[PDB]
Design an enzyme around this catalytic site. Structure first.
Site, short mmCIF file in Angstrom:
data_model
loop_
_atom_site.label_atom_id
_atom_site.label_comp_id
_atom_site.label_asym_id
_atom_site.label_seq_id
_atom_site.Cartn_x
_atom_site.Cartn_y
_atom_site.Cartn_z
N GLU A 200 0.76 -1.22 0.00
CA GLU A 200 0.00 0.00 0.00
C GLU A 200 0.80 1.29 0.00
O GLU A 200 0.22 2.36 0.36
CB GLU A 200 -1.09 0.06 1.05
CG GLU A 200 -0.92 -0.68 2.26
CD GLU A 200 -1.59 -1.96 2.13
OE1 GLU A 200 -1.03 -2.94 2.57
OE2 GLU A 200 -2.69 -1.95 1.59
N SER B 22 -1.76 -12.66 5.37
CA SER B 22 -1.95 -13.75 4.38
C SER B 22 -2.27 -13.28 2.96
O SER B 22 -2.71 -12.16 2.72
CB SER B 22 -3.04 -14.74 4.90
OG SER B 22 -3.66 -15.52 3.87
N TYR C 222 -11.68 -1.52 -4.43
CA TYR C 222 -10.56 -1.01 -5.29
C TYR C 222 -10.83 -0.95 -6.81
O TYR C 222 -10.02 -0.35 -7.56
CB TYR C 222 -9.25 -1.79 -5.07
CG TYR C 222 -8.81 -1.92 -3.62
CD1 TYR C 222 -8.23 -0.83 -2.92
CD2 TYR C 222 -9.02 -3.13 -2.90
CE1 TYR C 222 -7.85 -0.95 -1.59
CE2 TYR C 222 -8.60 -3.26 -1.59
CZ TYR C 222 -8.03 -2.15 -0.94
OH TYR C 222 -7.63 -2.23 0.34
N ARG D 11 -11.00 3.41 12.46
CA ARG D 11 -12.41 3.10 12.19
C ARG D 11 -12.72 1.68 12.71
O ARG D 11 -11.87 0.82 12.57
CB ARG D 11 -12.86 3.34 10.69
CG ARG D 11 -12.26 2.59 9.57
CD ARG D 11 -12.80 3.15 8.21
NE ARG D 11 -12.29 2.56 7.00
CZ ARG D 11 -12.74 1.45 6.42
NH1 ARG D 11 -13.68 0.79 6.94
NH2 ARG D 11 -12.33 1.10 5.20
N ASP E 227 -15.43 -1.44 12.13
CA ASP E 227 -16.20 -1.97 11.04
C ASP E 227 -17.23 -2.91 11.53
O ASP E 227 -16.87 -3.80 12.35
CB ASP E 227 -15.34 -2.62 10.02
CG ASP E 227 -14.23 -1.70 9.47
OD1 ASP E 227 -14.47 -0.43 9.55
OD2 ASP E 227 -13.17 -2.22 8.95
N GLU F 53 -13.73 -5.87 12.64
CA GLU F 53 -12.33 -5.48 12.86
C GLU F 53 -12.27 -4.07 13.23
O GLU F 53 -13.24 -3.31 12.98
CB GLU F 53 -11.45 -5.77 11.72
CG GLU F 53 -11.71 -4.92 10.44
CD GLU F 53 -12.65 -5.54 9.44
OE1 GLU F 53 -12.63 -6.78 9.25
OE2 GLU F 53 -13.34 -4.65 8.73
N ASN G 155 -9.59 -0.71 12.28
CA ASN G 155 -8.56 -0.32 11.34
C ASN G 155 -7.88 0.90 11.99
O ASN G 155 -8.53 1.90 12.29
CB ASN G 155 -9.27 0.08 10.03
CG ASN G 155 -8.38 0.64 9.01
OD1 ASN G 155 -7.29 1.07 9.25
ND2 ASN G 155 -8.94 0.65 7.74
N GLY H 252 -7.18 5.54 5.57
CA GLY H 252 -6.76 6.45 4.55
C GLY H 252 -7.08 7.92 4.82
O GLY H 252 -8.07 8.31 5.50
#
Ligand SMILES: Nc1ncnc2c1ncn2[C@@H]1O[C@H](COP(=O)(O)O)[C@@H](O)[C@H]1O
Ligand SMILES: [Mg+2]
Length: 311
Positions: A21, A153, A220, A259, A261, A274, A276, A280
């Site tokens: 990224e 992974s 994406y 954040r 989720d 999860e 994060n 971004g």
């Protein structure tokens, strides 16, 4: 506040890096640098792939805004190195950063502290995949989500719709993570995210993928994933979920930049997937949207995030 920008001293914006990224990070980091300089803060880019990390201390930087994403930037590695060198930084510390990338241990913590999360089982490499698949279907039904427990992974999340397909999905997942999570699919509601930035009262975002789930294509590729504010929920539920989201973050040791989720079922019950800890900060990213929805512009948001490295 009303923070004299002098109070921030000499600031690094960590951007670039070596991860997959690198791209989003360059984009986010150049915007963050501008946002801080728009506020009169003595900010400079610092790419740790291309500059020696000890220069942060040696050149007298006092803090850093972390605009890295993926690998060492998000998993506790660079957070530890920064603590070691005495450099303050945005976002979470070593434990919150590393625990936030580990879905297995995140979900255990949540289960023990009453943060709701999808019912799940684990499968280890070398397990009898056919036999585990039977036990898991029997407990959780179908559909299921098969995901890596841990960072980082190469096997994407898979939605398994039939019992007969489970064993192959387990065996493949286990080829690339020693621990595989198998979650009940939360159906019949919607998908949401709670951005967290200091004590800012940010609105929830409803995420509407055009296909099955918020897959790589939806995130994406797809032009048509919706990120909706207002999220559609009633005021009491929206407040309730924002509160749970902040507890979800806190119990992992994460500090309030990121954040959380979550899915809702048909009954309107939430299940957290999860956190994060490195969201971004591009011009199409979710925290700036949520902040602009409440009147907080991009530079004001980046200053607020940085302000917590004070004191
Ligand atoms: N247990 C679940 N129930 C429903 N949808 C899920 C679940 N797990 C993952 N997903 C979906 O798959 C996406 C990618 O999963 P992950 O990165 O684990 O969150 C999520 O953003 C959801 O769209
Ligand atoms: Mg990521």
């Amino acid at each position: 506040s009303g923070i004299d920008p002098k109070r921030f001293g000499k600031v690094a914006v960590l951007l670039g890096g070596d991860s997959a990224e690198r791209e989003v990070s360059l984009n986010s980091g150049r915007l963050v640098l501008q946002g801080l300089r728009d506020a009169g803060i003595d900010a400079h880019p610092f790419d740790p792939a291309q500059r020696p990390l000890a220069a942060l201390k040696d050149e007298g930087f006092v803090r850093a805004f972390n605009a890295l994403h993926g690998g060492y930037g998000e998993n506790g590695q660079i957070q530890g190195a920064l603590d070691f060198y005495g450099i303050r930084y945005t976002g979470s510390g070593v434990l919150g950063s590393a625990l936030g990338l580990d879905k297995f241990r995140t979900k255990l913590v949540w289960q023990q502290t009453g943060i709701p999360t999808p019912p799940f089982e684990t499968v280890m490499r070398g397990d009898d995949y056919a036999a585990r698949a039977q036990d898991i279907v029997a407990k959780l039904g179908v559909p299921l989500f098969v995901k890596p427990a841990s960072e980082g992974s190469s096997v994407a999340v898979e939605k398994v719709k039939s019992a007969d397909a489970l064993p192959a999905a387990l065996e493949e997942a286990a080829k690339h993570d020693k621990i595989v999570i198998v979650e009940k699919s939360i159906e019949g509601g919607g998908e949401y995210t709670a951005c967290i930035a200091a004590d800012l009262d940010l609105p929830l975002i409803r995420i509407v993928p055009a296909g099955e789930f918020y897959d790589y294509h939806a995130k994406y590729i797809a032009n048509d994933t919706q990120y909706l504010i207002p999220c559609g929920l009633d005021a009491a539920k929206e407040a309730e979920f924002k509160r749970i989201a902040r507890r979800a973050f806190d119990v992992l040791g994460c500090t309030d930049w990121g954040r959380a989720d979550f899915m809702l079922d048909a009954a309107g019950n939430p299940y957290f997937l999860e956190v994060n800890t490195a969201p971004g900060m591009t011009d199409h990213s979710l925290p700036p949207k949520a902040a602009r929805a409440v009147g907080i512009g991009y530079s004001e948001l980046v200053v607020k995030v940085l302000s917590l490295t004070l004191d």
